[PDB]
């Protein structure tokens, strides 16, 4: 069932949408965890490409987010 989980990008997202519409707990996790693995490893900008996102941060907020994360060991 990992073999199942290959698919296009919108065909995964759209699967999540209609996977909690019909209330399938098991499939919702499997689909979500697979988007989660797409994010793991990538840099901030490289995450913004893979999903077509647009940085909505002033450079003051960026360095604010940056200063807060410094209170957590990686």
């Amino acid at each position: 069932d990992a073999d199942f989980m290959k698919i296009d990008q919108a065909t995964l997202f759209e699967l999540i949408l209609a996977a909690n519409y019909l209330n399938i707990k098991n499939l919702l996790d499997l689909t979500c965890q697979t988007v989660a693995d797409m994010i793991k490893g990538k840099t901030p900008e490289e995450i913004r490409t893979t999903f077509n996102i647009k940085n909505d941060f002033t450079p003051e907020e960026e360095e604010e987010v940056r200063r807060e994360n410094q209170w957590a060991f990686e």
Binding site: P44, I47, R48
Partner: peptide, 18 residues
């Protein structure tokens, strides 16, 4: 989705996305 991220660094980088 984000519930499933074990990585502190990746998680830290998701924060910097938007």
């Amino acid at each position: 989705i984000l519930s499933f991220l074990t990585d502190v660094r990746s998680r830290h980088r998701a924060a910097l996305a938007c």
